[PDB]
Amino acid sequence: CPLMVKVLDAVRGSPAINVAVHVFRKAADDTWEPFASGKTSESGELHGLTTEEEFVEGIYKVEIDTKSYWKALGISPFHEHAEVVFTANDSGPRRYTIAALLSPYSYSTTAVVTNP
Amino acid sequence: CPLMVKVLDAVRGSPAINVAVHVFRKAADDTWEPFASGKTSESGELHGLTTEEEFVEGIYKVEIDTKSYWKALGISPFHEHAEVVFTANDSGPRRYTIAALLSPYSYSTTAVVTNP
Amino acid sequence: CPLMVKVLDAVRGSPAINVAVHVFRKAADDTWEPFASGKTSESGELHGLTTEEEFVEGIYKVEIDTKSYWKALGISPFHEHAEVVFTANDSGPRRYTIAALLSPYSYSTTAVVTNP
Amino acid sequence: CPLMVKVLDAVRGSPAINVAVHVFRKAADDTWEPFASGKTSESGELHGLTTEEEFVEGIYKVEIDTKSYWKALGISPFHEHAEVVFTANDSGPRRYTIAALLSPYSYSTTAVVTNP
Ligand SMILES: Oc1nc(Cl)c(Cl)cc1Cl
Ligand SMILES: Oc1nc(Cl)c(Cl)cc1Cl
Ligand SMILES: Oc1nc(Cl)c(Cl)cc1Cl
Ligand SMILES: Oc1nc(Cl)c(Cl)cc1Cl
Ligand code: NA
C-alpha cells in the first residue's frame, strides 16, 4: 500500500464511509490521466489503489468526491470536491497517506509520508 | 485591539454569532483569573476585550462556549468548550488574533500575530 | 467584493503575503477558463477580483500557489497548489470569502458566505 | 481501548512521536483529578490509557502537551498545550479516538466516537 486515503466526518464524529476517490496522474501531454479509483470502507479508509510497480514518479491528483458524499446524506454542501495535488516518489519510493476531515462548508487535508 | 477573537461555523459557512468568549490570565498561584469577556458580533468577531496597558506578558486562556452555540442551533456537539492557551510575549508582534473554526465534533484554532 | 480570498500561515502565525491566486470559471466544454487573479496583500487578503455583474452562477476554481510561497521561505512543501472548487449560487448569500490556512504538509479551507 | 489519542505533525508530514498526553476527570468538587497519562508512539498513537471498567461517565480533559513537543524539536510555538474537554459515556460505553493535527501556530482536533 504505497497510497492510502482516509476520510473523517466532523459533523457526525465518525469515519466518512462510501466516499468516492479518483486518482489521476499528469501525462506527458500535461493532461490528467485516470490512474486509480475506489471508495472508503466502514473505517473511512481506502486501501489497494495501486502497487509499488505501478506507482511511479509523477504528479498525482487525488480527487475526493465530497459533494457526492454530502448529497448522498441529503445535505447541500459548498465544495464540488477536494483535490490534493502532489509530486510523488521523486526521491525513490515512499508510502503516502492522504487524510481529509470534512464539514459541509470546510475541509482539511494532510499528508503522512514514510520511507519503507 | 491587542487581542481579538474570531469564530467561524464550518457547517453553515458563516460567522459564529453571539458566541460567549471568556478570557483568563494565569495568576501567580496557578489559578485562572477572569480577565475579559464578551459575545461575538454579527461578523463572528469580538473586539475591545482589553488595552495595551492591561495586556501584559503572561499566560492567557481563551474559552469559547461552543456547546451553547451548537445547542441553540438544535445540534448536539462533542466538546464542552474550546480552550486556547498561550503566552503573550512582548518580543513578538503586537496584535493577536485568535481564530477558531467550529464543527460539531471538531474545531481548529490558529493565531495571527502581526505588527501594525 | 462578491469574492474575496484570505490566506494564513500556520507555521509563522501570520498572513500569507504575496501569494499568487488564480480564479477560473468552468466553461460549457468542461475546460477551466481564466477569470481573475492577483496576489495576496500584507493582510493575506485579495480584494477586487471581480464584480457582481461578472460573477454569475457557475462552477469556479480558486488555485492558490502554495508551493511558491513555501519555497520562498526556504521550506520544501508537499502540495503543488491548493485548489478550491465550488458552485456560486444566487439563492444563497451574496458575498463569498474563501479562506485557506497553510502548513507545509497540510492545508484547510473554509467558505464564509454572508449577506451585507 | 475505550480511549485513544492520535497526533500528526503538519510541518513534517509525519506522526507526532513522543507527545505527552495527560487526561483528567472532573471530580465531585469540580476540580480536575488526574486520570491517566502517556506518550505517543512511533505511529503517533497512544493506546492503553484506561479500561472499560475505569472509564466511567464523566467530564474528561485530554491535555496534549504541544509546547513540550515543539520545544523538544527546538522550535518556539504559540500555544501552551491543546485541551480537549468532553462528556463521555453518558449514554453507555463508547470508544473515543481524539485526533490532533499540529503546527507551531495552529492545531486542529476531531473526535471519532463509535459504539462497540
Ligand atoms: O488513523 C488515522 N490516520 C490519520 Cl492520517 C488521521 Cl488524520 C486520522 C486517523 Cl484516525
Ligand atoms: O482551521 C482553520 N482553517 C481556516 Cl481555513 C481558517 Cl481561516 C482558520 C482556521 Cl483555525
Ligand atoms: O479574518 C478571517 N476570515 C476568515 Cl474567513 C478566516 Cl477562516 C480567518 C480569519 Cl482570521
Ligand atoms: O484537522 C484535521 N485534519 C485532518 Cl485531515 C485530520 Cl485526519 C484530522 C484533523 Cl484534527
Ligand atoms: Na529524482
Ligand code: NA
Ligand atoms: Na445518562
